[PDB]
Design a protein around this ligand. Structure first.
Ligand code: 2HL
Ligand code: 2HL
Lengths: 471, 469
């Protein structure tokens, strides 16, 4: 069973001996620190953490003894704050005396703004605020996946609008292929849910259960997929029988969309000769609601996409849409699911545009690029103490390393406001109390062991919409 | 509760319909495909077998749950309810699968078979690749353990050169990655993989994982020491940094203590606060209880070099038997910012050029150690190499025209020692010809049971560096 006393960085076990004596309050905040591009971030994922790990009776006598036993050996010394943990157990029935205030989930906020704050609600528990830094800072991950996924959606939207005149199908243009490519089952669920803030296509099944349990949607599920082959279901037929494999698969799934990986031996032969001649009759007969989606999976991503389109354009009837771009017939589409990240996505759609191919023709699958190849440094997600009360006096505190001004932190009690022009500003030093800037956008989401405000996944999606979608 | 029917890539739900009719066997394998990182540490499969694959993993409730989810997810009924029910009824929900693997901790060159998977019941031909997704996640502990060991090689080389021995090597790269990974589960897995090579960690989640799935003779596999963070310094207020330092080193006067010293001005902290104002509290400390000064910002190499030159002028420096400078034993440094395998190399080489012993330094690494890694680094990959259809075995493979690096292996595979004592993977069932001795893979999972396992102590022995051996 999960034990919050064993879910912090080891050194934090020793911090209760290090704060100034007579400290009754430690107040800390999380931001995606600005860096002298990702100019705005989607705030998402805290509600998962609050419910799974922080709420309710999280301290027991057994949990205290187990931590005591572990740390004795881990430090070769008795340093553990048993008294402090016992106090929470006795006084609060093991509920954390902490208050967390946060911007609403799904909100899109520029870098360098307070996103949430944490403080103890009982002076005895001044040490508790930063004990839970480690677990709260892990919100970096769903924030960063959601943000990076949204930035890819912006690129897709721009090019889809340019080449087609609308945004139809945008929410299915970037499919999560990342289940095998992330570091754990838990990560798979968290990351997949973050991508679904922006899109509806996923093969990372773990995301669905997380959303259902912690957030909730009006619809039965937040994400969808379609029948699709992998190399094993093609290659198992034997190298001389690729055509038989293709025929079998498209016939099995004749009335729904079907994606067929086509590069097992020779992607170009498969497109030109197998799909484009031998099996052409089984493709041109398909419904618009049930296209064949051809899937290359190797080679230079841009070069391969363009060559695949060129081949298909010569074997199938291509039209020219009202924007002047080439469009494959509605029973035939392409998905590029190899080597896709935010950079290569941009390269591919720009290359397509230059060759006069509509973005309507293509979708993308992304795995490692979408869910794994991200770190806390990308958006400088960071948690810092900004205010303490010692001997009954409040003190505004901060770091400001001489050799790196980018790592300077904010001072004092913080609040987030709308500016007169409708942008965001973080007020420092308790200046929000002056009330010159309207209401603090941070809301209490956790207090003394209870989750006090929750968001549905539908609300989060609404909050995270693109401007272009809003227009 | 975990449901293995919901723990695969969506598209695999539809694969039972795609294989050739009358297929009775699907046999697949995992390798770190050949293209830096010439050899890999095999680690972490045991965790996966025990936590997710063994015992009764199918129930009526789990089948119904999956059925209901997939119906909405595909907007169609494509889920193999009958196949899963068969496993439930015939095997009491135990997976009819056999997995063979190289021993955990083994160090194996790229492009060798590391584990194989096949169904043991013809009805469950589809099951082999259903569990690809789960098993492929072994890329992560493999890659962490491998990259950690590569850093250990660098540290060993330079420590040996500058000091004449490897004392303390196992404490020279400390895991700071708990906050910088993507989840609690990932933290435990990644921390455990780092502990294959080192003994220093702050990612507490690693300890319980090792204890539960692997085991050590020692009470714990990893250790830490009291250390400050910026909040415990800055909380004292900007004019009271000295007071914070004094309080902390006095509280931890007889154990090692690490104190982050860059809150405002690392160079002032080292030269004036530690080097002058509080010097008397440092030079009095035991060799078993040094002050470890922690810079945490600036160019990592330039900052380490300047911190060392500052301390070298305020404290008595000796010259060790190799001709390198050594701080007194009550004083050390740890660089815990911007450390990955690349910058680690740069820092130790820069220290060597300035005649500073690697004895003086330790490193902390977080995202660089546990997060900034992907399945592409070692090309960790699972592929089908052999099927039986209509009673006939076929050797199968992919070989994409535009990328020969993605060509997969053919047929039944086995791992062997060559006449020169190296590893070789034989394809096409050629291991059966008995020209290369016995298969070095062992059966580790069969029909719902873990059949062979390794303690964490044995994994560590297998993973030792040559220079350690
Ligand atoms: O192979 C697949 N997934 C997978 C998972 C893990 C590892 N590798 C691959 C896979 C999964 C879902 C797929 C897929 C292929 N091909 C299409 N989809 C889902 C959607 C089907 C509906 N879509 C289209 O019709 C469409 C496709 C291209 C352009 C415009 C529209 C857009 C994508
Ligand atoms: O600040 C720390 N950890 C942390 C965790 C998460 C996020 N930020 C920081 C932290 C953790 C462990 C530390 C530390 C500092 N400073 C030293 N250690 C552990 C060990 C203590 C014993 N060691 C030495 O005495 C030693 C140090 C340098 C050279 C030679 C020997 C080697 C390192």
């Amino acid at each position: 069973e999960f034990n919050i006393l064993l879910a912090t960085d080891s050194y934090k076990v020793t911090h209760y001996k290090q704060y100034p004596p007579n400290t009754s309050k430690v107040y800390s905040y999380f931001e995606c620190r600005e860096k002298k591009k990702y100019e705005e971030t989607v705030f998402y994922g805290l509600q998962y953490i609050l419910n799974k790990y922080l709420k309710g009776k999280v301290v027991t006598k057994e949990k205290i003894q187990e931590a005591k036993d572990v740390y004795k050996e881990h430090f070769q010394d008795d340093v553990f704050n048993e008294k402090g943990w016992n106090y929470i157990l006795e006084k609060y029935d093991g509920h954390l005396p902490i208050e967390i205030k946060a911007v609403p989930e799904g909100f899109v906020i520029p870098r360098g703004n307070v996103l949430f704050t944490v403080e103890n609600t009982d002076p005895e528990c001044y040490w508790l605020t930063n004990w839970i830094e480690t677990i709260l800072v892990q919100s970096w991950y769903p924030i960063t996946v959601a943000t990076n996924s949204r930035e890819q959606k912006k690129i897709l939207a721009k090019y889809l609008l340019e080449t087609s005149g609308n945004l139809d199908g945008l929410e299915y243009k970037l499919h999560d292929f990342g289940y095998r490519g992330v570091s754990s089952q838990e990560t798979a669920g968290i990351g997949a849910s973050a991508h679904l803030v922006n899109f509806k296509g996923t093969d990372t099944v773990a995301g669905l259960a997380l959303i259902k349990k912690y957030y909730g949607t009006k619809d039965p599920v937040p994400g969808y997929s379609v029948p699709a082959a992998e190399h094993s279901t093609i290659t198992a037929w034997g190298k001389d029988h690729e055509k038989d494999a293709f025929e079998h698969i498209v016939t099995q799934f004749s009335s729904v969309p079907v994606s067929v990986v086509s590069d097992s031996y020779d992607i170009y032969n498969a497109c030109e000769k197998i799909w484009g001649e031998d099996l052409r009759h089984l493709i041109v007969s398909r419904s618009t609601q049930a296209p064949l989606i051809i899937r290359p999976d190797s080679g230079n991503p841009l070069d391969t996409v363009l060559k695949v389109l060129e081949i298909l354009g010569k074997k199938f009837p291509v039209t020219e849409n009202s924007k002047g771009y080439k469009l494959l017939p509605p029973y035939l589409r392409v998905i590029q699911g190899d080597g896709v990240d935010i950079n290569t996505l941009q390269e591919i759609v720009e290359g397509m545009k230059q060759k006069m191919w509509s973005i309507e023709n293509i979708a993308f699958g992304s795995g490692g690029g979408l869910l794994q190849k991200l770190t806390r440094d990308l958006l400088n997600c960071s948690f810092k103490c900004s205010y303490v009360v010692t001997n009954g006096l409040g003190i505004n505190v901060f770091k400001d390393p001489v050799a790196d001004p980018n790592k300077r932190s904010k001072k004092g009690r913080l609040s987030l406001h709308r500016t007169p022009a409708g942008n965001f500003v973080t007020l420092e030093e308790g200046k929000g109390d002056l009330e010159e800037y309207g209401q603090d956008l941070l809301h209490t989401v956790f207090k003394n062991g209870k989750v006090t405000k929750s968001y549905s996944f539908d609300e989060i999606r609404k909050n995270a919409q693109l401007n272009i979608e809003l227009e």
